[PDB]
Amino acid sequence: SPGIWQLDCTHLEGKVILVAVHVASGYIEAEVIPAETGQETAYFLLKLAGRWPVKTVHTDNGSNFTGATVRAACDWAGIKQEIESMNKELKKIIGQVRDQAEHLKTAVQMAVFIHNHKRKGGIGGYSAGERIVDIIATD
Amino acid sequence: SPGIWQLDCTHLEGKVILVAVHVASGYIEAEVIPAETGQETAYFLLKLAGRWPVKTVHTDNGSNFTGATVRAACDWAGIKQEESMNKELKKIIGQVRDQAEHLKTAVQMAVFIHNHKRKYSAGERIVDIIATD
Numbered sequence A: 001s002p003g004i005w006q007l008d009c010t011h012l013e014g015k016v017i018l019v020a021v022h023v024a025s026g027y028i029e030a031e032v033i034p035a036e037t038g039q040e041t042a043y044f045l046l047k048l049a050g051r052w053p054v055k056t057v058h059t060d061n062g063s064n065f066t067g068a069t070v071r072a073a074c075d076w077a078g079i080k081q082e083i084e085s086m087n088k089e090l091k092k093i094i095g096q097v098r099d100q101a102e103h104l105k106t107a108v109q110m111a112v113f114i115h116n117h118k119r120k121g122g123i124g125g126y127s128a129g130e131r132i133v134d135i136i137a138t139d
Numbered sequence B: 001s002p003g004i005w006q007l008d009c010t011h012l013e014g015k016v017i018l019v020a021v022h023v024a025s026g027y028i029e030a031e032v033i034p035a036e037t038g039q040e041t042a043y044f045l046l047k048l049a050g051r052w053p054v055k056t057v058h059t060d061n062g063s064n065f066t067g068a069t070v071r072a073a074c075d076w077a078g079i080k081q082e083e084s085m086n087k088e089l090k091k092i093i094g095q096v097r098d099q100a101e102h103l104k105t106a107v108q109m110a111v112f113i114h115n116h117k118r119k120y121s122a123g124e125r126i127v128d129i130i131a132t133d
C-alpha cells in the first residue's frame, strides 16, 4: 500500500491539472499539463514513477489511458492500473496564492508546496511530506 | 545533511535540463526547461521544494539566480543559497534516447533508471536519510 497512488484530473482556467495522491499519506504531486492526452499523461506518470516507488495507480480509466502510449509507459515503469477533497483542498490553496503568481502553473506548485508541508496536528502533527517518507522508509 | 541539494544546468540538443541532486543520497530530480531564465529556474526550484524538504541549494550562482524572481522564490520556499551524476545522466539519456519521441521523455526515463538502480537505490537512500531526519 506504500506503492499505491490515485491520479485524477482537475480543471482551472481552461487548463488541465493532473493530481497524483499518495493514498496512504495524502502527499501530492500535481502539474498543469498542456492537454489531457495519452502522451502528456504517460509523461506525468513516468515522471512520478521516477521519483517515488509507484506500483499501482488508481485512475479514472478515461480516454487518456486507452492508447498505446500510456499503456506502454505503465508497462515500462512497472506500473499496474487498478479524491475531490484533495482536488478542492488543492483548488482552495491555489485560490489563496493565485494573486502572487503570474502563471497558474506557479500557483499550482505553490499550492503543492503548502499542501505537502502543512503540519495540521499542532505540535504533534506530521506533514503529508513527513508521512510519505516515514511510510516508504518503513516499507 | 538531509536538506542539501546541488542544482546544475546541462545542455543536450540545444535544450536546457536542470538537474537537482540530493547530495547525501545521489537521488536526482531533472527536467527539460524552456530556457535558462530566472522565471523557469524559480519554477523548477518551487517544484522541488514542494516535493522534498529543501533547506539549502548549492547553485552555479550564474545569471538565472541574480533576478527578482528566483530570489523571491527561494525566500518564499525558505531556501538559502550557499555534477558527477550529471555526466552519468547523459549516458542514461543516450541509452534510452531511441524509445522516446521527445527528449523530455528520455530525460524522465533516465531519471527513473538512475533513482531505481540498485547496486540500496538512490530512491531508497533519500527516503532513509530523510526519515532518519
Ligand SMILES: Cn1nc(-c2ccc3c(c2)OCO3)cc1N
Pocket (backbone or CB within 6 Å): A113, A116, A117, A127, A128, A129, A130, A131, A133, B049, B050, B051, B052, B053, B130, B131, B133
Ligand atoms: C522533517 N521532515 N520533512 C519532510 C518532508 C518530506 C517531503 C516533503 C516536505 C517535507 O515538504 C514537501 O515535501 C520529511 C521529514 N522527515
Ligand SMILES: Cn1nc(-c2ccc3c(c2)OCO3)cc1N
Pocket (backbone or CB within 6 Å): A049, A050, A051, A052, A053, A136, A137, A139, B112, B115, B116, B121, B122, B123, B124, B125, B127
Ligand atoms: C523499497 N524502496 N523503494 C524506494 C524508492 C524511493 C524513491 C524512488 C525509487 C524507489 O525509485 C525512484 O524514486 C524507497 C524504498 N524504501
Ligand SMILES: [Cl-]
Pocket (backbone or CB within 6 Å): A007, A008, A009, A036, A060, A062, A064
Ligand atoms: Cl486523467
Ligand SMILES: [Cl-]
Pocket (backbone or CB within 6 Å): B007, B008, B009, B036, B060, B062, B064
Ligand atoms: Cl543553472
